[PDB]
Amino acid sequence: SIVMTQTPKFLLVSAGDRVTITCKASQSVSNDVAWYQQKPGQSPKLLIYYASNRYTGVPDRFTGSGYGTDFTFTISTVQAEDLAVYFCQQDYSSPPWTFGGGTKLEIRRADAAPTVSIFPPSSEQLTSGGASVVCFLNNFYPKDINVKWKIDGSERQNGVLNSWTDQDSKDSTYSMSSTLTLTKDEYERHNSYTCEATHKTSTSPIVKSFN
Amino acid sequence: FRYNGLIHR
Amino acid sequence: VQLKQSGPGLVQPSQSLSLTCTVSGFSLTSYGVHWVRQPPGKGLEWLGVIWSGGSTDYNAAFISRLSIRKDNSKSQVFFKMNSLQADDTAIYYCARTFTTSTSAWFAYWGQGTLVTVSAAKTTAPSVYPLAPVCGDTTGSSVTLGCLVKGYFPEPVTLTWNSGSLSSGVHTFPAVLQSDLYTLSSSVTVTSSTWPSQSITCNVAHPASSTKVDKK
Amino acid sequence: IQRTPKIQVYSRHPAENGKSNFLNCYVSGFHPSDIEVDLLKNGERIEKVEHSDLSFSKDWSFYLLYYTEFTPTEKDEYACRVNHVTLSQPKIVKWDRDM
Amino acid sequence: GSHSMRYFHTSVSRPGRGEPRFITVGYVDDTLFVRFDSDAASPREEPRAPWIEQEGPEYWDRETQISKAKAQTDREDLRTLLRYYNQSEAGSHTLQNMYGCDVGPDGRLLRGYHQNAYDGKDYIALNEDLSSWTAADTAAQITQRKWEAARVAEQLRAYLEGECVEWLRRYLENGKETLQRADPPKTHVTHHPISDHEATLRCWALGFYPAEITLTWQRDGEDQTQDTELVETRPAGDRTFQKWAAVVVPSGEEQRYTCHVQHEGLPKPLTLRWEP
């Protein structure tokens, strides 16, 4: 029941940096702290144990320190692979053994331009009834991006669904998917479906269309 | 029967 | 040394959650298996443990509704939580400390079981393949997609050619709309590998026991 | 490190009212070793306390057995009061013949 | 008919209350035969079994002084770890140790161990080979170099493979009427109606030795492990142990679920049932 206060909640930095986290306990814990790395879709992996001891197979770049109330985690060299949610834990108290809030490690990279791709609705969905025009936005920095659906010059904003991917463990870039959920009756009404999006890199939006 | 070589840590 | 978890991914409100964590590489009669949950996008919460001797420790806020039991012979550990509610929707991992000691730092963890507390019934996905324009405007590189629509509950696993290529692949997370999820993915290869060679997306929705391969 | 004890209050031989029997209180799983344990006869502390020698398990958790000769009746209520560094208030656990 | 001989050591630092408390206890299987408490009128290795008090005065002197000295080695070991971990002087810390030999049915050793733990968490253990060390933390690695240069693991291999076996053997022949006497469990089934259909059917197993027992409930041959609550095996006090397993069965179905017991004291495993 010892409240473990993790700081900061968010941490954005470029590759090859020295970043610090701080887990402060409400009550004294004689070196009974653990440190984990939870990559998206994956389980938390034990980085460090007993405050300062590196777990087997964990590299030298990940180093922990502290005793009693104050505890810190520091990364020697920040890499694209290190991107995850970092947590801490206490094991000194009685059975409910608390965890820290978490530290979302986001990374800095050079602001790249996206690669737009417009996908016509498949012959299979148009059989079932539905008709969704999907447009992908790939390999870009930063995360913030605006999408605009237009049909023959007529803007459609209602019924649009958007999904962003986790920052890549390779190139630190981002990717987005825009869907236009419509019926066959609504689809057979028009011929030209255009796809355009606004980004920090270019003033004029990247145009992608079909018939 | 005990072991008697309890060498310091 | 492994922990293989299995169990239902959707529970109706006020009902139980029976889970199974099947261990290997170590004897059950020696080590202690813990149970820690994680609400989506939130911190971790230790729920309970079953010790070597059959003794147990439960997170007090759970003691009546929680029950952990184990079959030492069959290397299995069961987690039954009665009368589930919205606040219990999370991923359930079973974990173990490096040694026999009553330590709580977890060296080994399960893959987790995503449980969804909902009265909304299971729905199977409708997967359709997404290929570019009729005309060849590919040049040197081309991008292909695979949309997953109207499925429930989460998750769905999507790989391309059983995982042979994993270089230029992106899977966009699902979005909920009217108790339904819609997912998508994208691959980026050279014009030398398509349509000259074969490419297919491997969709699996186990909650609806769906296993589909579309090209 | 601090781990709370796991109490168990049972009899040596099955339930037979008036028969000479023993009242056991198996406290196990606690750490550190410092544990205050007392047995109770209808809420009143029994002075005839006798306990085992401090041994630990393969998970390094300690265990002690506090035992005393008792005469089970119908109207009498027997419990066991445990106190540990982890314990906020003394853990009183009532005895059940079906348990 | 596989047996064992283990020694337990507890050394807890009590600052202000004088000097640390040392409690060392010897066991054969599940039978406590020797004990030593640092705080005693005149501390000595005391007999707790009738077969061990048979041993000669020269035996009791040796055994006593080893524990008397272990306590002092542990008292220093505590101060050594206080420096290693750079922790408070006034703090109360625990030093745990256990070494022993697991012997087979025909008298030869299979498992040997020398593991110890500071403050309830593992420190350094002797691996199955009896020649290697595994340190838990970085301070446990200081003891590693010390014990790898002083070849501490060698003498232990000689003790565990040699004298540990020779004596566990002597003790097995000494008190056979209490050690090799396999106690079968006095078993029965208790019915708890609850209310109407759901009823708890408890399976009792009392008066068995050793502590190793397997209790299961079976509905037409299917293990009901998921729906069975099992208490940890507990000591009765009279040299024997007890354990129960219970299941919630609906009314009418009461004559399907069967109880199964597995123990050394039994020749063939029993398939007992509830009988009104």
From TrEMBL, chain E:
It is found in: Cell membrane. GO terms for biological process: antigen processing and presentation of peptide antigen via MHC class I. Keywords: Disulfide bond, Glycoprotein, Immunity, Membrane, MHC I, Signal, Transmembrane, Transmembrane helix. Disulfide bonds join 101-164, 203-259. GO terms for cellular component: early endosome membrane; ER to Golgi transport vesicle membrane; Golgi membrane; lumenal side of endoplasmic reticulum membrane; MHC class I protein complex; phagocytic vesicle membrane; recycling endosome membrane. It comes from the Eukaryota. Residues 185-271 form the Ig-like domain. The keyword Transmembrane applies. SMART domains: IGc1. Its main location: membrane. The keyword Membrane applies. It is a single-pass membrane protein. InterPro entries: Ig-like_dom (IPR007110), Ig-like_dom_sf (IPR036179), Ig-like_fold (IPR013783), Ig/MHC_CS (IPR003006), Ig_C1-set (IPR003597), MHC_class-I_related (IPR050208), MHC_I-like_Ag-recog (IPR011161), MHC_I-like_Ag-recog_sf (IPR037055). PANTHER family: HLA CLASS I HISTOCOMPATIBILITY ANTIGEN, B ALPHA CHAIN, MHC CLASS I-RELATED. Belongs to the MHC class I family. This is MHC class I antigen.
